[PDB]
Amino acid sequence: GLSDGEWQQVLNVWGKVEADIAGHGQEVLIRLFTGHPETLEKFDKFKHLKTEAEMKASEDLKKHGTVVLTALGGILKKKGHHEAELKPLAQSHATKHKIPIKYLEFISDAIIHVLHSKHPGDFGADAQGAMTKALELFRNDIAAKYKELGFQG
Numbered sequence: 001g002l003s004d005g006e007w008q009q010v011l012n013v014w015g016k017v018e019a020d021i022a023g024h025g026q027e028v029l030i031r032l033f034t035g036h037p038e039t040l041e042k043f044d045k046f047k048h049l050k051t052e053a054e055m056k057a058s059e060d061l062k063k064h065g066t067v068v069l070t071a072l073g074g075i076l077k078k079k080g081h082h083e084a085e086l087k088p089l090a091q092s093h094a095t096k097h098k099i100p101i102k103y104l105e106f107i108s109d110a111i112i113h114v115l116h117s118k119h120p121g122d123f124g125a126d127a128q129g130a131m132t133k134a135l136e137l138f139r140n141d142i143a144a145k146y147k148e149l150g151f152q153g
């Protein structure tokens with residue numbers, strides 16, 4: 001798990017995100033879709049986005065980025081005590097959305113990239129270590145639910 005000090009770093013970084021949730025959320029999804037175009041195919045409602053300019057111009061993409069980062073923020077504020085919040089997310093992403101755990105790795109990497117990109121020189125080595133640990137915990141607990149369900153892809 002994470003130490004008290006590590007959770008404090010995580011939630012400090014998260015304050016940066018909360019100042020512009022939609023902007024951060026938009027940039028995370030664009031990083032995901034452009035780096036890994038197969039992920040776009042999981043979203044019927046974003047498949048029409050053929051260029052990054054179209055992605056940037058999509059107000060619905062920003063809306064979805066808000067939904068995604070709001071959910072993640074709720075989970076992070078539980079400091080690992082997130083069974084009730086995480087279980088339904090794991091089950092919807094396995095059973096309904098069919099999202100392999102690989103894609104959660106991709107979006108975790110995207111969050112780290114966007115933090116550096118939006119906050120260059122203000123996302124320190126300790127903060128990166130703590131945020132990475134929190135995202136691995138999130139991913140690892142989803143993975144346990146995926147194994148229960150026998151889900152791979």
Ligand code: HEM
Nearest residue numbers: 039042043045067068069071072089092097099103104107
């Ligand atoms: C930080 C990780 C993620 C979080 C917190 C998250 C959260 C959410 C939430 C709250 C919803 C709406 C409620 C629901 O259907 O459960 C949702 C929907 C969805 N998610 Fe995620 N998600 C994450 C990662 C991903 C990834 C990596 C993909 C695909 C690569 C994905 C694909 C989808 C799709 C296809 C929907 C339905 C979209 C729609 O048509 O409205 N999610 N997600």
Ligand SMILES: [O-][O-]
Nearest residue numbers: 029064067068
């Ligand atoms: O994408 O959630």
